[PDB]
A paper describes a structure:
As the virus buds from the cell, the viral protease cleaves Gag into several fragments, including the capsid protein (CA) that then assembles into the mature capsid shell (core), rendering the virus particle infectious. The CA portion of all retroviral Gag proteins folds into two separate domains, the N-terminal domain (CANTD) and C-terminal domain (CACTD). In mature lattices, CANTD interactions form only intra-hexamer and intra-pentamer interfaces, while CACTD interactions are also involved in formation of inter-hexamer and inter-pentamer interfaces. Our results show that, like lentiviruses, RSV is sensitive to IP6 in vitro and in cells, where in the mature CA lattice IP6 binds in a pore formed in the center of the CANTD hexamer.
For further analysis, we rigid-body fitted individual CA domains into the EM density maps of hexamer/pentamer unit pairs. These structures and models indeed confirmed that the mature polyhedron CA lattice consists of structurally different, intrinsically flexible CA hexamers that strongly deviate from regular sixfold symmetry. The hexamers that are adjacent to pentamers are deformed to allow bridging of the tube-like areas and the pentamer vertices. Further analysis of the different hexamers forming the mature CA lattice in polyhedral CLPs revealed that despite the deformability of the CA hexamer, local symmetries exist in the lattice. In contrast, the structures of the other two-symmetric hexamers highlight the structurally dominant influence of the pentamer, where it actively defines the conformation of its adjacent hexamers. Specifically, the two CA monomers facing a pentamer adopt an arrangement similar to those two CA monomers in the pentamer, causing an increased spatial separation between the CANTD’s of the hexamer.
Residue numbers in the entry:
A (entry chain C), B (entry chain B), C (entry chain D), D (entry chain E), E (entry chain A), F (entry chain F): 11 to 148, 152 to 229
């Protein structure tokens, strides 16, 4: 086990302190420090340092809930990269939260007994929990493209607000498309309307609009 | 033996000077500089440099107590990674504190005679002693939510004061909940009281209150 | 599998944030972080972090198209470094995009089953897709030297717009020369026209004009 | 072949951006990054990144001219550290500019076939070309000492304009002296005129004037 | 001979400038730069750079005195690691201070003729002289706890003044305890007096007082 | 040959720009970057970068004069560490200033042919020339110890002004002593007057005064 640099952690903590929890730069920095699969000890101490007390409580709750969903999916499929083939490799929440035997407080033993699939599942769970808490602490149908705003900024803002919302995963693309069509002030509205081809994906709409946009 | 960089030690000392002993960034930095197993000379000089005189005295006391607990566990189990199989490898406190023969003041001889299990035990003992002294050096039942204070600030302050107190670990969540219910001025009190669902976690209470709070 | 440093990724993300997608320094930095053959997981997370949402959608599209061209060339030649000799080693797009069995979400298994030729093909495809999206996200024949603008600023702007355009590499110097001659308001036009020597390079024209320019 | 750090290149590019091309700190930094013998690929990409488009064109021109002078000296002496003893080792400009066979676009093959004498000659040529372009990209006989200006500022400005001009090196000191005597408003003119000793160096004149100047 | 880095020397000089001569961090840094056996030239230039003029004079005096004590011990024992077996290897102070023939001003010749025992003796002498001058340049029995001062500040000040004084190392703890008992205004005096347990360490006294102190 | 870091040179240039040429911190920094023996190329470029045009002219003059004094001492003693035993190793000023054959503009050849004694003599000459120019560009008998000034600051200022003046080297110590006795306001005057021992050195006077000074 190798610990994360306290210099990077201090810089990330100050980033969270000045920019907040929800800024795209903060989420990018968290994704950066969430690159290598971390042990429960690492993520727990990281969130202890960068988050205040109340956001840390919220994050512990959300992390537990997401890990429980993961364990339900794991008991629903014996081919989980955290599981094994026999029943003796089934992964309990004590092993995920670092509470199992030989792991409590010891990061070396933790790194010894944990699986790489376990590590990546814990890491993805912690990232999703961070996203939930950030969305909770401090509206996609109210987003309009400003008269002076460019289209890539509007698309970034809209996709951010739609993906970081309460919609099901299978309802984000149609909503993003229909919001591109009805928002995005009438010049781009007519540009999308008069599309000789049928655009059936937000990426394709973005590419088309970026090609044929009125340079100004 | 290779000494730690005085640049890292100076940066850590300034971190302790500005952030304090108990900040999570400071504990992360200490864990960072506590990564490789250190010899008693290294940890002793490190604490001499980063800590003031009175915290250094407290830390010497706490380190001695923790090492004594370790030696009691060692005489309670002949399979300690610091011990050996025969009685001639039993580890005395003079060998742990660096006071044994051939070690006093000489880090090279120290590194020669010491075991890796000895080093990791000394290191873990020093880390626990640092935690104790940090918790000791610098009231939750007196915390009220001010008339103008927001709820996340009140929750942060309350969770901080409850977790940094003398309560057992298994009594913090019920106390935090019952303090959310009885403190947190009567508007939020009635908001929590009339909860159609049963809230059984501080994170869930915080989420509910943040959702249904009176925007003002 | 070893992950890329989040410090390098954070520095690259800030580079993309300040300099943009198309600057030569940004492309050099991407080439730097594109040195070792990356697994689909690595490149996917890298583009997720450094690119915004809409450029990331565009990049996913372009990467898919380039990988499809690669797979067409692969079915057009059984000697692809990603292919094998028999038909059982033919590489499907599920194996290139990391969607095949034993690879979805698991970078360790990914690194296990993938070929080095597969890795380098994926990497080159991702680099070409990044170039396409950068050229798409953000006109030389409309550039005139303003009445008050100096000549070095005009030359900088013109060379920038000509080299960052859709012209072939072998057509940039003649175009830059003929734009120096026809733009660059009639004082400098006559200064270049009455050149006793024949100027056959943009650098030589710039040097001549800087020597004989009307100091004002 | 090992590439130069993009961090050093970014720092050097920002140095060139803020200080300019001609500052002594910039030339020192270039000499620093010009320490190990670089391959044509390295120097070419370095100048592509640190220099703008028009200075890069000028630098390509100057580098070609200096390399041609080097090749003329090489055909004038068969004992060039780039040449060999037989005629089969004669070095063509395609091999110096990296255009020869097995080198175009490939830095590894470049490093394979190139000689150390070739590398140092290319490097010195590139440094001289950079100096020429820096002197070219950015009048002594019009410099007067202002009524309110101090003498050290006037001397600095005059020596700067005289040394950064088209005079031969052996004509700068007499010109600086005779400009000290005829410029430098009549109080200092009479102070230099009535010098009991003969001052035959700009430094001696500066020292004398600083000693006997009218404190005001 | 290899010189010490001017970067390390500049950092050490600024450390001495901000922290002073007597801080434990400064002595640690000096011990760091005093790791390899230095030639008289190195130590002399080092003290010339890091110390001011008057401390440098004091240090020259103290270094001479300590070297004279070393030479007296050397003439009192022919088995000095600087001496040899015959009388022709006896080490004169001109050879220690670098004043002997073939050494004055030349570090290369110095490194040639000097012995490793000579180097380590010179180095230890210089370190002891630095300690003396630091103790000399910039009262524990006069320290009282002010009426408004907290107890941790008083303990810090007292431990600082007692450890940075002329007492033997084995007499600091009893003095600190007996000064806690007789200073530290009568409320804390009575608090320590009525201790049901016997406190036999400054850290234990500090912990007890911090526990049972009158919150105000 | 290894060049000096442009980062250190930039920091030193900014130090000279803000603090000036004569500040003790600037002279300490110059001594730091003057630690290893530099080649004429290094010192020449260093002074070109850190000094303005007029101070650079003055410094070239002073460096030439000091090197000429060195060469006179060298022809006055055939045992110069730059000289050799035979007449064929006599060192000409073209070899010291880097103007000799095989050295003009080439630092590698310079480092090849130069002697270490040559390097240290050039370095000491350049340092003395820098001191002269710094004293010249922007009075010891006017120095008084202020009513509130400490004694070590007064001693530093006085020794600085006396050693950086036009006095012979054999007249500095008596002047420093007699200035300690007559300046240094009457409390310290009487403290030095009533010295039971005879103080015959500035260091001894400083030590005595620091011992018996009135703590306040």
């Amino acid at each position: 086990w190798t610990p994360l640099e306290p210099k990077l952690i201090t810089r990330l903590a100050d980033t969270v302190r000045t920019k907040g929890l929800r800024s795209p730069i903060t989420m990018a920095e968290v994704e950066a420090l969430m690159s290598s699969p971390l042990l429960p000890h690492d993520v727990t101490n990281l969130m202890r340092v960068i988050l205040g007390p109340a956001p840390y409580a919220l994050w512990m709750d959300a992390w537990g809930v997401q890990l429980q969903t993961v364990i339900a999916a794991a008991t629903r499929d014996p081919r989980h990269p955290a599981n094994g083939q026999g029943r003796g490799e089934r992964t309990n929440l004590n092993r995920l939260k670092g509470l199992a035997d030989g792991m409590v407080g010891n990061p070396q033993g933790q790194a010894a007994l944990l699986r790489p699939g376990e590590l990546v599942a814990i890491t993805a769970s912690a990232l999703q929990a961070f996203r939930e808490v950030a969305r909770l602490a401090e509206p996609w149908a109210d987003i309009m493209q400003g008269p002076s705003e460019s289209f890539v900024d509007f698309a970034n803002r809209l996709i951010k607000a739609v993906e970081g919302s309460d919609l099901p995963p299978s309802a984000r693309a149609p909503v993003i498309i229909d919001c591109f069509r009805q928002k995005s002030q009438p010049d781009i509205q007519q540009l999308i309307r008069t599309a000789p081809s049928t655009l059936t994906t937000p990426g394709e709409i973005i590419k088309y609009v970026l090609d044929r946009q009125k340079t100004a």
